[PDB]
Design a protein around this ligand. Structure first.
Ligand code: NAP
Ligand code: NAP
Lengths: 221, 223
């Protein structure tokens, strides 16, 4: 089984790769914007050479345009795709959210993952599990009220949630498993706990179209 | 008792029919926008016969047009009672894998950021008026909880994104006694733009509560 994780240099992403590397016969394609500076990740892959460290900046169309070749070097197929790399920089009122915050969350948090998936679909198609995971947020629900505004961040997660739902429909007749997943907040949980829950969720999940919290319970779109 | 309405995209479709419906009411000034007024024949003829109809250039895809809308609307009115973000595109349907980069971008810029920026620019005029009504023309296709079997690609994504932000805005501006709504105007079983316009103008006048996702008939849609 070949897993792919965007944004593995730190946070939940690093914690997922670290758990995958422990598991028998898991090859992990793990990305960073700057793999040369990804001290902890590189260290992981030297210690566990089944972990391959590829360059990806999801905000950069020219970086996304190489991801298939870069991943093609290490695998003929992806079993489980995880769009984890994402930003979360702007919150609060719309009147107080400038143009740039909106644009950046769009390109990085919505277009990024759609292009990433578009590029890597041929490699996912050739694989066995045909599992596609977009790491969303519960803040992306149209039907949850946190007593908070999420500005471009929330909008971005809602937009990707919309397209995830659509993708789940479109790829059902190819036995694909597409899910949006809230990894928790890191009541706060450790990267290690988030990772553990997600790895369990990645192997267990058998139906497509779901919007799941890390614990495996459903969220309202 | 004089009310100013603002409609983005009034040169054709639902936009024109709304301006036309409004022009018939007495004590209603209408700020009607067109990307290219020079060639807005029907809308210019409406304004020529109806001096209460003011035509103004707006491209919601163009930050340079948005920077100008406040000062330019301000030549024609001191306030906006009812804001209607009607101008949109619908140029992307079908599967995610067949939707090229450019259709995602264009739908974001025109259908999400355009209206946000337009509202930002026009908020102070709307703060200054009586009705404080803020309508975003959405689609039932933007619902995260309706299934029509069809793919709406970047169009639907753009309507969901604006929906999410519309709902947050209804929260933010409840303390300033704003009425904020996303409205599905119908599919134009089809209705005509004139029926859509008659039902929308009824809704604009009657809606007395914020934070709704509505169809043209005043029934609620799930987010
Ligand atoms: N934070 C939460 O608790 C929470 C809650 C709900 C959902 N989520 C989702 O879970 C994901 C993982 O969160 P995290 O907490 O691990 O985030 P993080 O550590 O704060 O940073 C996000 C990760 O993505 C990478 N990244 C950022 N921009 C990138 C770009 N343009 N191209 C490629 N990679 C980029 C980052 O690398 P750099 O180090 O280079 O920035 C980092 O690995 C989030 O991105 C978010 O959407 C998180
Ligand atoms: N038609 C339907 O069945 C339907 C269904 C659901 C929702 N809606 C929504 O209802 C609203 C009205 O649509 P419609 O049916 O009247 O369709 P339409 O004919 O496409 O309406 C477009 C209007 O918006 C203007 N516009 C387009 N792009 C613009 C831009 N970049 N800047 C400024 N103005 C621009 C158009 O002007 P130009 O002449 O310059 O293009 C035109 O006046 C739209 O927001 C649409 O999304 C319509």
């Amino acid at each position: 089984q070949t897993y792919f994780i965007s944004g593995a240099n730190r946070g939940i992403g690093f914690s997922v790769v670290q758990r995958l590397a422990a598991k028998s016969g898991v090859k992990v394609i793990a990305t960073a914007r700057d793999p040369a500076s990804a001290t902890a990740l590189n260290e992981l892959a030297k210690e566990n050479p089944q972990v391959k460290v590829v360059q990806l900046d999801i905000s950069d169309e020219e970086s996304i345009k190489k991801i298939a070749k870069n991943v093609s070097q290490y695998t003929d197929s992806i079993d489980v795709f995880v769009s984890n790399a994402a930003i979360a920089k702007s919150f609060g009122p719309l009147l107080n959210t400038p143009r740039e915050q909106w644009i950046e969350h769009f390109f990085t948090n919505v277009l990024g993952p759609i292009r990433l998936f578009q590029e890597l679909y041929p490699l996912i198609k050739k694989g066995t599990q045909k599992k596609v995971f977009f790491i969303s947020s519960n803040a992306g629900s149209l039907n949850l009220d946190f007593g908070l505004d999420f500005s471009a961040y929330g909008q971005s997660k809602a937009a990707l949630n919309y397209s995830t739902k659509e993708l789940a429909r479109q790829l059902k007749p190819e036995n694909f498993i597409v899910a949006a997943v809230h990894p928790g907040v890191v009541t706060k949980i450790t990267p290690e706990e988030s990772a553990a829950a997600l790895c369990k969720l990645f192997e267990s999940l058998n139906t497509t179209g779901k919007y799941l919290s890390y614990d495996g319970t459903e969220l309202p779109w």
